[PDB]
Design a protein around this nucleic acid. Structure first.
Ligand SMILES: [Zn+2]
Ligand SMILES: [Zn+2]
Ligand SMILES: [Zn+2]
Ligand SMILES: [Zn+2]
Ligand SMILES: [Zn+2]
Ligand SMILES: [Zn+2]
Ligand SMILES: [Zn+2]
Ligand SMILES: [Zn+2]
Lengths: 94, 101, 98, 105, 82, 106, 98, 81, 107, 93, 100, 100
DNA sequence: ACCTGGAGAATCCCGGTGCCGAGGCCGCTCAATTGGTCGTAGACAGCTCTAGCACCGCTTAAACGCACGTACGCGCTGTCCCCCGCGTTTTAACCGCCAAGGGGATTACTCCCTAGTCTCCAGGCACGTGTCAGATATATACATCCTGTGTAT
DNA sequence: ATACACAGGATGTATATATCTGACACGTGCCTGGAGATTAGGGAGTAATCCCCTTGGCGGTTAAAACGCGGGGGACAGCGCGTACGTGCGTTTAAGCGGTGCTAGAGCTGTCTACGACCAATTGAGCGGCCTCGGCACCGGGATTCTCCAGGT
């Protein structure tokens, strides 16, 4: 009965935003959850390494940006950087 | 360096915009060739332009072409990985909406 | 006199058929018995979850399909159409597993 | 099919902001698909490394590698603007009529 | 009981089907024992690491997450089991 | 009267949960304010891309749902996404159809 | 007549010599210029520590030596003694780099 | 000014590297393919090195940058720090 | 009142306290137990001694007094378990083993 | 400018094993790097082991399990024995 | 050379600590190299899994795989001890005679 | 296998010679099972292979493995490193006491 | 079809000499050690109930064994052009300075941002329910493979 | 006389309708974790200074790269034999489904106390220079191993 958490509802919301009239099965959502966890873990580890190399004790958005530059290939990195900067500028404006 | 300005280009003057109210006559056949999607054979909608050859297409046309078929440009056969290699071209959309609403 | 297909026709048929599907190709109970027999050499009176055996079978079949994919290229490299043990040995040497 | 339109509505989509005149040998920056003149952009990219309008970085070190010619737009503007190609050819001939050097360019 | 001879449960037609999914057309007759050897080596390695993970946790039952951690330790990430 | 940070950033993926996961994960002594927002945006983007391609693949089959086969097709037919997941195995995904030219009849 | 060695002798001599030595086999300044030229597409007016150029060269030489060993194995598989571009392509594909 | 410096990887250097690799007979179309391979490898490593240098707010590339860049690629180096 | 070191209390040559501090400051967990650094230092010294002994034998074989990178490389690539431990590692100024394929020899 | 490395301890171990033998500066650099690499690998595996079982403390048990996972064959057995011997000697003191 | 060696000095080296006698069909444990008799080790290992001298594990689940017959040691004990091999064969044949 | 036979299940113990007795021995008697196959001399710091139970001198086997094939000199079986052997103290002590 | 002798070119061995890098010493200051208190992570006993192992018939689809013939694996031969070995002539890497200065590395000061604490309420998760997307079944209809047979060059 | 396009037979694959059920998707009540306000201190941004090391010029000596030629052995195509594969048939084995009963062990709670974090004072281990000989690098010489082609049979 213990609570277990996942990213299922957020994935469903994104899918309804991109393909309004489509579903998804249990196994496909399991795979999507694994994909999201893998990405989070990789980026966090690379940011930690960056912070440690430079003798700093904080992870800021700068570390995340450089880690994304290091990890994703090609145009995926460009689009991800643009989206991240957009989100941060929107958030700090409140 | 394939970009050196020619002698005339080093001294070319701007072309003054036409301000007098003169009517313009345009026929559908004149713009027929340059404003036609090679794939669907219809008027362009939601224009997408490649990052390598600057060839206009419809979003669905290019998406379907890349999905089931070679990962190449339909026109010049140049390679392109996916839809991230194209970007929207709203200027052509506005031009289409203006000339032929 | 029956309608005998020439050699190689049914082979291409089966290649197409099995590259169209996603089902497991090895029977369950034999694989489970093999897994238990191998595990008996590291710890006594083990128990398994069903999903653990499923995960092992999935990973193993993926591994073997990829290995045969490389083996076929090695066999075609030498102007052949038939795989042999030497092709598997070369693929596993170049991949680093040996 | 059949339609006649004024030049006022067409003007905005034919003039280069850097110089103000109609597009001549249009060239497009691909980072944002922004069209300007060949000479305008060639002179502009020397001092700056950002787009004149949206200030988007053309390239990390060398912007000239990320700009390409736009033939279709040039043909469209030639067909639309009345008496534009003829004037361009006349100006080119006039400029090169008094220079007896480098015949082949 | 002491299980034995179970490797021969991986039969000739099953290996043929696996080679079909990999795009193979003709198969030599000495190639059904090599596959069994390779499968045994791979399985031994993965199962040993899974058993180590199980033993550290002080458990008597191997779980799917143990298999997943063991596979990830060998550079064979697997999506679909948690 | 309380507004979630996800809405403030214009996002769906949770910003507070990701902030907490960064704080308790042994990555560094301190976590800034902009890090979780940035990382949440990147995760949302990648998920949306993959799901879009899988939805197209599902539409081609005349199916209204996405199954692991459609995700496999989407990922392997995409070059950059195929580089990102070069060492991953997706269960019940099968393979891509492919036959070498020398094996086909002449 | 003047003495001439049969083909394959001096090649074996050179294999014996270079498999026992340990020094760098690419000239230094040309590699330095190549490094600066390639880096000029990421940042302008960059400076390099000498040990950084040295580390880059050492790693590059190790990479090429390993590749050539795999290529020789692939070429011998097909009953030849001459290595060819297709052997390089096959080795790189099986390695996962192609 | 730096241009066409990949031709400084002469043919005899390529032959010496192949001899250390054990090769006995070489085709005439192996040198261009080797140069292509090398250039791709160098682009990939130097990109990461320059990323590390840029993040640390410097203008000099050190040996640690190269070491970390190689470690990212899975090609650990020993003996430089 | 005399200060007695932990390495001496353990019988090691490697530094226990420095390894304890490195473990504490490296972002590996909230707490570190007392015996963990002793165990880690013991393992580290054992591996160092193994490699050094093999390389010393290789240096003696060559009639040399000082260990250089070549002896490390020979000691490490002639041992199966150590080769497996360092498969993705390059050693500067090492070289390769002598190896000519059988099919390529004359006669 | 105080810098730290394992040089003096590695020299002591070499003198224990090989009473009359020298080492070069570059070889000592390689040995330093090797020791650092092993330390990092084992510490990272121990961190993961503690996180999988929901514990906040790395102990000798985690180090032993990590050494078993990481080292191949006989190296594992010998290293395990040496670590256990060291801990037993330490505690009784 | 010639020597007059007293067996009383060599007794501990040639005595099995499980049956209180000399080695017969000696078998050694790989891990610790501790010798015993075939019967002694076979019947003893069916319950425990540790050597009865140094207290070291032989195998995780099946110790029988880590014990090997030492022909050299058995030959040495047969040769050094006078009037032992012959007596062993005599007893074996006499036992065989008494049963079908 | 290692399954005991009918007679092995009831072998009687061999009593030890408690009474002090002297036994005459000669060096040539044991000049076959105490001799190193490599250096053809007396054993010192004996080392034994796990798989085959073959005795060697430490330096002999160490050099043979380092400067040659990685197989056992006698049986030609797989051998990885000096970790694959183990010292034999009992054999050395017996040799020392038997031969001064 | 195999052998030997002898000339030539290359690798190994041996002193002998000179320098420079490795082993060692000495003063000092920063990090490891001892001693004390305090709070919680982890050990352990006990309890619930989920799920993993074991057993038994019954269909039936897959596995197993057999036989024929065909096409592919492998050796042999002949051909020619591509690459190796070696000699001559050019290019330019390597090494010894000198001169300058860009920026890497450290220090001091100040204030802004992040951790820790406490209150309180909405976002997310565990159950429960019910239609329809998708699988399963039958039956035509269509598209490939193979072979006989005329027959044109 | 032989290639060769053609046509009829017969498999297998694709397609449209019927239908059956169980899993996706939604709703709901509650409780745990995210949000808001407050406070305090140390990490990091900033400005200034010093001096190591990177970049540039130049002149020289000489090993390495470039060009060319000639001939042999290695890649490549073709032909023939034969035997090991594939295809199809007629038996035999064991996977698989459904149902059952049993209980070992994973997942929780609740005490409770030993072990690790924190702080302060004290000093000895470890690091930055500095001096200096002995290992090793270099040069010339004699010995030693090994290819290669002419007889020799
Ligand atoms: Zn279209
Ligand atoms: Zn195009
Ligand atoms: Zn303009
Ligand atoms: Zn722009
Ligand atoms: Zn006994
Ligand atoms: Zn024992
Ligand atoms: Zn010996
Ligand atoms: Zn042996």
């Amino acid at each position: 009965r213990k609570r277990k958490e996942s990213y299922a509802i957020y994935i469903y919301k994104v899918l309804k935003q991109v393909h309004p009239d489509t579903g998804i099965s249990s196994k496909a959502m399991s795979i999507m959850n694994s994909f999201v966890n893998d990405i989070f873990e990789r980026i966090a580890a690379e940011a930690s390494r960056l912070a440690h190399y430079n003798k700093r004790s904080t992870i800021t958005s700068r570390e995340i940006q450089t880690a994304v530059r290091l990890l994703l290939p090609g145009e995926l990195a460009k689009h991800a950087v643009s989206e991240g900067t957009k989100a941060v500028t929107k958030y700090t404006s409140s | 360096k394939t970009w050196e300005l020619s002698l005339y280009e080093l001294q070319r003057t701007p072309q003054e915009a036409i301000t007098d109210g003169l009517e313009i006559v345009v026929s559908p056949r004149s713009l027929h060739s340059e404003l036609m999607c090679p794939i669907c054979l219809d008027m362009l909608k939601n224009t997408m332009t490649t990052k390598e050859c600057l060839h206009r297409f419809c979003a669905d046309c290019i998406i379907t072409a890349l999905r089931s078929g070679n990962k190449e440009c339909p026109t010049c056969r140049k390679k392109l990985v996916s839809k991230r290699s194209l970007r929207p071209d709203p200027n052509f959309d506005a031009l289409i909406s203006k000339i032929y609403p | 006199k029956p309608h005998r297909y020439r050699p190689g026709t049914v082979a291409l048929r089966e290649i197409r058929r099995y590259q169209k599907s996603t089902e497991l190709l090895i029977r369950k109970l034999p694989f489970q018995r093999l897994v238990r027999e191998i595990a008996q050499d590291f710890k006594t009176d083990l128990r398994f979850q069903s999903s653990a055996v499923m995960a092992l079978q999935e990973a193993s079949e993926a591994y073997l399909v990829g290995l045969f994919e490389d083996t076929n290229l090695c066999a075609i490299h030498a102007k052949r159409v038939t795989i042999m043990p030497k092709d598997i040995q070369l693929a596993r040497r170049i991949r680093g597993e040996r | 099919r059949t339609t006649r339109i004024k030049i006022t509505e067409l003007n905005p989509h034919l003039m280069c902001v850097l110089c103000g005149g109609y597009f001549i040998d249009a060239t497009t920056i691909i980072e944002c698909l922004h069209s300007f003149c060949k000479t305008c952009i060639v002179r502009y990219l020397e001092t700056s490394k950002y787009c004149p309008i949206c200030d988007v970085q053309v390239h990390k070190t060398r912007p000239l590698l990320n700009i390409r010619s736009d033939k279709t737009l040039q043909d469209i503007v030639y067909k639309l603007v009345p008496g534009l190609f003829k004037n361009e050819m006349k100006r080119r001939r006039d400029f090169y009529a008094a220079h007896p050097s480098a015949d082949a360019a | 009981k002491v299980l034995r001879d179970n490797i021969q449960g991986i039969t000739k037609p099953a290996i043929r089907r696996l080679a079909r999914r990999g795009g193979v057309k003709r198969i030599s007759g000495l190639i059904y024992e090599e596959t069994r050897g390779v499968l045994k080596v791979f399985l031994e390695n993965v199962i040993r690491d899974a058993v180590t993970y199980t033993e550290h946790a002080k458990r008597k039952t191997v779980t799917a997450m143990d298999v997943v951690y063991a596979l990830k330790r060998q550079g064979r990430t697997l999506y679909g089991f948690g | 009267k309380a507004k979630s940070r996800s809405n403030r950033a214009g996002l769906q993926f949770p910003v507070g949960r990701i902030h907490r996961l960064l704080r308790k994960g042994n990555y560094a002594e301190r976590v800034g304010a902009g890090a979780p927002v940035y990382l949440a945006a990147v995760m949302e983007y990648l998920a949306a891309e993959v799901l879009e391609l899988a939805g197209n693949a599902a539409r081609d089959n005349k199916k209204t749902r996405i199954i692991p086969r459609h995700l496999q097709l989407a990922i392997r037919n995409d070059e950059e996404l195929n580089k990102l997941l070069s060492g991953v195995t997706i269960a019940q995904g099968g393979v891509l159809p492919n036959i070498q030219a020398v094996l086909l009849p002449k």
